[PDB]
Each structure stands twice: as C-alpha cells, then as structure tokens.
Amino acid sequence: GPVAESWCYTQIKVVKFSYMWTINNFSFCREEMGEVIKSSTFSSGANDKLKWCLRVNPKGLDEESKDYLSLYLLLVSCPKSEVRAKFKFSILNAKGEETKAMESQRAYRFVQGKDWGFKKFIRRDFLLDEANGLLPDDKLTLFCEVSVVQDSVNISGQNTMNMVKVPECRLADELGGLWENSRFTDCCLCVAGQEFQAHKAILAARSPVFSAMFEHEMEESKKNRVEINDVEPEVFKEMMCFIYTGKAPNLDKMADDLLAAADKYALERLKVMCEDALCSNLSVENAAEILILADLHSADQLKTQAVDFINYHASDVLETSGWKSMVVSHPHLVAEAYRSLASAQC
Amino acid sequence: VDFINYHASDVLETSGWKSMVVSHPHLVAEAYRSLASAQCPFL
Amino acid sequence: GPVAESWCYTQIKVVKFSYMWTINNFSFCREEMGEVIKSSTFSSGANDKLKWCLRVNPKGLDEESKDYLSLYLLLVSCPKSEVRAKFKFSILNAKGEETKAMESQRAYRFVQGKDWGFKKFIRRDFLLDEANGLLPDDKLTLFCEVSVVQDSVNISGQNTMNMVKVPECRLADELGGLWENSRFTDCCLCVAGQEFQAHKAILAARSPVFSAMFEHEMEESKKNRVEINDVEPEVFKEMMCFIYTGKAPNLDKMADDLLAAADKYALERLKVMCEDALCSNLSVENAAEILILADLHSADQLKTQAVDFINYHASDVLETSGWKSMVVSHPHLVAEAYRSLASAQCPFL
Amino acid sequence: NAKGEETKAMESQRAYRFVQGKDWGFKKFIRRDFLLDEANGLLPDDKLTLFCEV
Numbered sequence: 001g002p003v004a005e006s007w008c009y010t011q012i013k014v015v016k017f018s019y020m021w022t023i024n025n026f027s028f029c030r031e032e033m034g035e036v037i038k039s040s041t042f043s044s045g046a047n048d049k050l051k052w053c054l055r056v057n058p059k060g061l062d063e064e065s066k067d068y069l070s071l072y073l074l075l076v077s078c079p080k081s082e083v084r085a086k087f088k089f090s091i092l093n094a095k096g097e098e099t100k101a102m103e104s105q106r107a108y109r110f111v112q113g114k115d116w117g118f119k120k121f122i123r124r125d126f127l128l129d130e131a132n133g134l135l136p137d138d139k140l141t142l143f144c145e146v147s148v149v150q151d152s153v154n155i156s157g158q159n160t161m162n163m164v165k166v167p168e169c170r171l172a173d174e175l176g177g178l179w180e181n182s183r184f185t186d187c188c189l190c191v192a193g194q195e196f197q198a199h200k201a202i203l204a205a206r207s208p209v210f211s212a213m214f215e216h217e218m219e220e221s222k223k224n225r226v227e228i229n230d231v232e233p234e235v236f237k238e239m240m241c242f243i244y245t246g247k248a249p250n251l252d253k254m255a256d257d258l259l260a261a262a263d264k265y266a267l268e269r270l271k272v273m274c275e276d277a278l279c280s281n282l283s284v285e286n287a288a289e290i291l292i293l294a295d296l297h298s299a300d301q302l303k304t305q306a307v308d309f310i311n312y313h314a315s316d317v318l319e320t321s322g323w324k325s326m327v328v329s330h331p332h333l334v335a336e337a338y339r340s341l342a343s344a345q346c
Numbered sequence: 347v348d349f350i351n352y353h354a355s356d357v358l359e360t361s362g363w364k365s366m367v368v369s370h371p372h373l374v375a376e377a378y379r380s381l382a383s384a385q386c387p388f389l
Numbered sequence: 390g391p392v393a394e395s396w397c398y399t400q401i402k403v404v405k406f407s408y409m410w411t412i413n414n415f416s417f418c419r420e421e422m423g424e425v426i427k428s429s430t431f432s433s434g435a436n437d438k439l440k441w442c443l444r445v446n447p448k449g450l451d452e453e454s455k456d457y458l459s460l461y462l463l464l465v466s467c468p469k470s471e472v473r474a475k476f477k478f479s480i481l482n483a484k485g486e487e488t489k490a491m492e493s494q495r496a497y498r499f500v501q502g503k504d505w506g507f508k509k510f511i512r513r514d515f516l517l518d519e520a521n522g523l524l525p526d527d528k529l530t531l532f533c534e535v536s537v538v539q540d541s542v543n544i545s546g547q548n549t550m551n552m553v554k555v556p557e558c559r560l561a562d563e564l565g566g567l568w569e570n571s572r573f574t575d576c577c578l579c580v581a582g583q584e585f586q587a588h589k590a591i592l593a594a595r596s597p598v599f600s601a602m603f604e605h606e607m608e609e610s611k612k613n614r615v616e617i618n619d620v621e622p623e624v625f626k627e628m629m630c631f632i633y634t635g636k637a638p639n640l641d642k643m644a645d646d647l648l649a650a651a652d653k654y655a656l657e658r659l660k661v662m663c664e665d666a667l668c669s670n671l672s673v674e675n676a677a678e679i680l681i682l683a684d685l686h687s688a689d690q691l692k693t694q695a696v697d698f699i700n701y702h703a704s705d706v707l708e709t710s711g712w713k714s715m716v717v718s719h720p721h722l723v724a725e726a727y728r729s730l731a732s733a734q735c736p737f738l
Numbered sequence: 739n740a741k742g743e744e745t746k747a748m749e750s751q752r753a754y755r756f757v758q759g760k761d762w763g764f765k766k767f768i769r770r771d772f773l774l775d776e777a778n779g780l781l782p783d784d785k786l787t788l789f790c791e792v
Contacts, residue, residue: 019394019395019396022399023399024401025403028496028536030473030496034760035757036757037399037541037759038757039397040546043395044395096390163690164664166661169560172560175594178590178594184589205563205567311389315387318382318383327375328371331371331374332367334375335367341381342351342355343358345386389398
C-alpha cells in the first residue's frame with residue numbers, strides 16, 4: 001500500500017430489493033394465450049416511490065413461446081425521469097432452494113411503464129414435469145432481486161488537509177460524567193430508600209412531564225425529596241442515564257419495566273427502542289404478557305407486530321397457560337386479535 | 347362459532363359483539379380458538 | 390427462504406359443488422332419439438346465486454351418439470356477466486365407488502343458458518350390459534363435482550412501512566426551547582447594560598473559565614455583579630447561541646473577536662472553528678494583519694498557514710506596507726523568519 | 739389536425755377484454771413520415787393532439 005497525499009472514492013450506491021411471490025391454483029390458469037396476471041406494487045425503504053410489479057403470461061406472448069412461460073418485470077412508479085436497474089430471476093422448488101437461475105447481464109434503463117424480461121424464460125413442460133418438483137401442491141414460487149443503481153458521488157478525501165482534529169459533540173459524555181462526579185446538585189433525590197444525588201434543572205430540561213409538575217406547588221417545599229416508587233432504582237439509574245448521556249446501553253435484561261416507566265413518563269424515543277428489543281424477544285411462550293404489556297402501555301406498533309406474531313404462530317401459542325391467563329385477564333386483547341385475524345387476514 | 351369465524355368481517359361491526367366482549371370474557375377464548383387452529387392458517 | 394421486505398400472496402377463490410343424481414328404473418326411458426330429462430336446480434349455501442342443473446340424453450343427440458349416452462351441464466341462472474369453471478363427472482358402480490370418471494381440463498366460460506358437456510360420455514350398450522355392474526337394480530347414479538373459479542384477489546403483504554422509524558435527536562432542541570422560553574431564571578448577568586439569563590451547570594461544563602470563579606465558593610454575588618468587559622455583549626450572545634443551539638451562522642464577519650473570546654474562555658473547539666473560518670479568508674493585502682492576530686492569539690494552525698502563504702506569495706506580500714510595519718515593530722519576527730528561511734535553504738551561496 | 743377536425747380515425751372491430759395490465763391497440767397506427775409531413779397539418783405548431791373515445 002503506497003502512501004498517497006490525495007484519495008478519491010467513486011461511490012455508486014446500490015439498493016437491493018427482496019421479493020417473494022406465490023401463486024395458488026396455478027394449474028387453474030383459466031385462460032389461453034394472451035393472459036396477463038399483475039401483482040401487488042412493492043418497494044423497499046428507498047423513498048417509497050420506486051414501485052415495481054410483475055407481469056406473467058402463463059402460456060406465452062407469441063408463437064416462439066408456446067412451450068415457454070414468459071416472465072416480465074415492470075416499473076409503474078418512479079420519481080426520477082429515468083432509473084437504470086439490473087435484475088435477477090429465479091424459481092423455488094419444493095425444498096426452497098433456487099433453481100433455473102438466469103440474470104439480465106445489462107443494467108437496463110427503465111422508464112414509466114417500460115417492460116424488460118425473458119420471453120423464453122423457462123420451458124412449460126419443464127415446470128409441468130412433477131418429477132422435477134418445481135410445482136409443489138400447485139404452488140408457483142418466484143424469488144426476484146432488483147438492484148437499482150443511482151448517480152455516483154465522490155468524497156475527494158485529502159489525506160492528513162485536516163491539520164486539526166475536529167471533536168464530535170461532547171454534550172453527551174460531559175453530562176454523563178457530571179452524574180458520576182455528582183457535582184452542582186442543588187437538591188437531593190431519593191427513590192425506594194436509596195439516594196441518587198440529582199438536581200431538578202436538567203430533569204425539567206429533558207423530561208416534559210417532570211417539567212410540568214415540578215413548578216406546580218412542589219418546588220417550594222418538596223424539592224429536597226421526591227417520592228418515586230413505581231420502578232426500582234436499578235431501572236431508575238438507567239432512566240437518568242438516558243436523560244443525561246442520551247443513551248441507555250443496558251437494554252435486553254430489563255426492557256420490560258423500562259417500557260413500563262417510559263409510558264408513564266411519556267418517553268417517545270424510549271418506547272420504540274425497547275419496543276425493537278422486544279420485537280426480537282417475541283417468542284411463543286412470552287407473547288401473552290407481551291400483548292398484555294403492549295396494550296397496557298399503549299405501544300401501538302408493538303401491539304401490531306405481536307398480534308402478527310400470534311397470527312403467524314396461532315397453531316401453538318394458544319395452549320400455553322400464559323395465553324390462558326392472558327385470556328382470563330384481558331378479553332379485549334383476544335377481541336382485538338380476533339378482529340385482526342378475521343377482518344385483515346381472511 | 348363456525349358462523350362467527352366465517353362472517354366475522356361483519357359480526358364485529360355490530361353492537362352485539364361489543365356487548366359480548368364487555369359481558370362474557372371467556373367465550374371469546376373458544377371463538378378465537380376454533381378460528382386459530384382451523385380454516386385460514388395457510389400463511 | 391430469506392425474509393423479503395415486501396411480498397404478495399395470490400388467492401383465486403374456488404367454490405365446489407358436490408351433487409348426487411340417482412334415477413330409478415332407467416330402462417323405462419320411454420322415448421326414442423331426442424329425449425331430454427332435467428334434474429332439480431341445485432346450488433350450495435354460498436353464494437346461493439349460481440344455480441345449476443343437469444341434462445341427459447338417454448339415446449343421444451347426433452349420429453355419432455347412436456350408441457352413446459350423453460351428459461351435459463348447463464347454468465340456469467347467474468347475476469354476474471360470466472363465470473368460468475371446470476367440471477368432473479362420474480358414475481358410481483354397484484358398491485358405490487367412482488367408475489368411468491372423465492373430466493375436462495379447460496375452464497369453459499359459462500353464461501345464462503349455455504351448456505358444456507360430453508356427447509360421447511359413455512357407451513350406452515356398455516352401461517346396458519350387466520357384466521360391468523354399472524347399472525345396479527336398474528338405477529343410474531351420476532356424481533357431478535364442479536369447481537368454480539372467481540375473481541383473483543391479492544393481499545399486498547408488506548413485512549419488516551419500514552421498521553418503526555424514530556424521531557430526530559433531541560439534544561439541542563430541549564435547550565433551545567428552554568432558552569427561547571427564558572424560564573427558570575437562575576441568574577441575571579447585567580453586562581454592558583444588557584441583561585442575559587443563564588444557569589450554572591451548563592456554562593460551568595461548557596466553559597472551564599466560567600467554572601473557575603464559580604469553583605471559588607462565591608456565586609450569589611458573582612451572578613449579581615459579574616464583571617465582563619473584555620468581550621462585548623453581542624459576541625457574548627453569539628457565544629450563548631453557539632453553546633445552546635450549537636451553530637454560529639454569522640461567524641465569518643466576526644471571526645477575530647470570537648477568536649479572542651475563545652482564547653479568553655479557553656474554548657479549544659471554538660478557537661478551532663474561528664481558525665478554520667479565517668483560514669479561507671486570506672488575501673494579498675491583510676495577510677500580514679492575519680499573521681499579527683495569529684501571533685498575538687497563539688493560533689498555531691493559522692500562523693502555519695500564514696507562514697506558508699508568505700513563503701509562496703513572497704513576491705507580493707513583501708510589497709505591501711503591512712509587511713514593512715512588522716519589520717520595524719517586531720525585529721524578533723524578522724530574525725525568526727530569516728532563520729526559518731536560512732535553515733530551510735541549506736544549499737546555495 | 740391544425741383545424742381540430744378528426745383525421746385518420748381507426749376503430750376496433752371487436753370488444754376486447756381487459757384485465758389490469760392488458761393492452762390493446764394498433765401498433766401499425768400511422769406512418770411516422772406521414773405524421774411529420776406538414777402539408778396535411780398533422781403536426782401543428784410542434785403539438786400532437788389525440789382524440790380518445792372509449
């Protein structure tokens with residue numbers, strides 16, 4: 001590696017799409033030559049405006065595709081005038097592995113309502129042969145990858161101008177060290193019989209509810225001692241750590257009662273982060289009290305995804321004694337799960 | 347229970363379902379049970 | 390199977406009718422060629438708008454069916470424009486199991502009063518002989534199983550709307566709103582006439598110089614009678630805005646006095662920002678003035694850049710009278726500059 | 739055309755069915771040179787006007 005004074009990085013950002021497409025009752029193709037079957041418009045988290053869809057002619061487009069299934073990719077919505085993209089097609093067998101994988105060698109230029117694909121995509125008899133296992137229980141599965149390339153940018157990184165190092169924001173770690181130094185505490189603060197030397201100014205600065213009731217007829221008398229007993233000091237110290245440092249590293253051990261305190265204290269960012277922790281902590285046995293706590297502490301998206309977990313695992317979550325206790329304690333939870341399972345799913 | 351499973355897209359709109367939810371907590375268990383372990387787990 | 394961000398399930402709804410049609414003493418067919426006898430109209434519970442019936446010709450329809458029993462299926466009522474379906478027929482044997490079950494693989498488009506069936510459904514003499522047992526007790530059993538396809542629907546299932554999203558970082562906002570509301574008046578700093586409101590801990594953490602005299606156990610008198618005159622209150626307000634909001638937009642026109650305030654207040658980051666702004670401010674006439682300010686304020690990077698600027702543009706910088714002023718006023722600067730040139734240029738006479 | 743009266747009108751002799759994504763029309767609609775010709779007035783003032791009846 002030779003040392004160079006100047007660097008240059010030509011960065012071409014690529015966006016990758018994953019898409020799954022299943023066809024039930026495909027042998028009931030209901031039509032001859034000339035039929036098109038569109039799919040749902042889909043996009044990933046790239047501006048939510050790169051909408052794609054798929055067109056399939058189950059018999060063929062023309063006479064050169066009589067024994068060929070034709071598969072096409074269509075772009076319906078795009079904010080830019082034109083977008084170039086490179087795509088890959090494959091089909092899944094019964095066991096889920098990829099077979100008959102072919103790919104378009106060029107990043108073709110797409111525009112509004114432009115088609116690109118393989119007319120001679122696959123032999124029709126090759127799919128119709130059940131010995132290949134390509135059509136398990138008349139389910140036609142396709143896996144599609146879309147790679148959108150955008151305009152490149154350059155960083156043009158001169159290597160050590162930067163004669164002086166630029167420090168980042170020290171407002172986090174200075175306030176974090178102020179807690180362990182325990183300096184400039186104008187008042188005392190004891191919770192659950194244990195002393196945590198805290199002052200009211202930054203508490204009112206960085207929690208809206210405490211800024212609300214501190215000024216209303218309690219700072220004159222009860223400023224030296226505030227009574228909080230809804231949560232233990234082990235979670236209270238991490239609460240104040242998130243107040244002061246801005247971050248709470250201790251999450252997975254005790255994300256439950258941290259949410260219980262966060263909903264009490266109206267903590268918008270602390271709701272979603274422990275929510276994302278319990279999203280990965282969603283399991284079969286604990287989902288009953290997950291639905292209990294999500295609805296009791298008004299975590300709406302956590303309620304939604306835990307209900308989706310119950311929808312995807314409804315064969316075995318019910319016979320757990322935790323779910324039976326959740327039923328006999330919260331009828332409205334079972335009613336809402338019924339509403340989602342009936343109105344939305346079927 | 348089969349009827350409420352098949353026509354539940356309109357059962358829960360009526361006020362009778364809300365009265366059921368408020369008054370009888372334990373019947374919704376069996377109503378969700380037969381809907382859960384039958385007739386739509388294909389996802 | 391990897392989890393996709395978005396996916397789709399395609400559901401083509403299918404309903405199934407199962408129908409059992411037994412006629413007794415078929416040998417009393419009672420008619421010649423051209424006979425048709427229908428069945429009762431039938432359907433299932435859902436949606437109870439598509440009623441069907443059957444039709445059989447015991448002798449046949451045409452000259453190909455002289456010795457052929459013919460079976461036809463027709464739709465008798467339909468509220469929609471058209472409905473496609475596939476059908477399968479069968480004949481129960483004496484024991485009741487399916488025999489001669491033959492079907493049509495293509496979905497026919499049905500409409501009001503349209504028929505689809507098989508003229509050569511089965512051989513009439515084959516049914517008539519008793520060796521095969523397909524006419525038990527002179528009774529004809531017909532099993533009709535038909536599947537109707539409906540309009541396809543898609544659920545548009547989107548999965549891990551991406552994640553949950555989080556709000557913007559809320560460090561500067563909660564302090565900027567507190568300053569704009571000007572609530573919790575801890576102290577009043579009446580400096581150069583104008584009075585400014587702040588707290589103790591924020592200024593003590595941001596400025597060690599502001600922490601210095603407040604560490605000396607005197608605060609209630611120092612906040613009442615603070616003596617600030619080296620920096621004017623406009624630049625003090627700019628320091629206040631840079632501490633709370635985190636930005637200094639008008640620093641370009643006021644780099645020098647904010648640099649002096651940073652030197653007084655020991656704010657290394659603010660000094661670095663002032664030096665970075667004034668680095669891209671060098672010209673051919675006031676570069677000596679910038680060097681003088683850097684030498685006075687001990688600005689290392691700024692003084693190095695001024696030295697490089699002089700050493701490259703020595704054909705024009707030395708021409709100005711600002712270069713000659715520092716020759717008379719600072720002979721030590723002349724000595725160190727001449728030594729820096731001489732030590733760098735070791736060769737040449 | 740330039741005057742606005744309908745010219746070069748072609749219609750479909752069958753009632754084609756349509757599903758979401760199915761197209762029907764005349765790919766051999768009009769000669770591009772005949773359109774770009776100016777004497778017939780088919781391209782007035784760099785504007786192309788089309789009349790759609792469905």
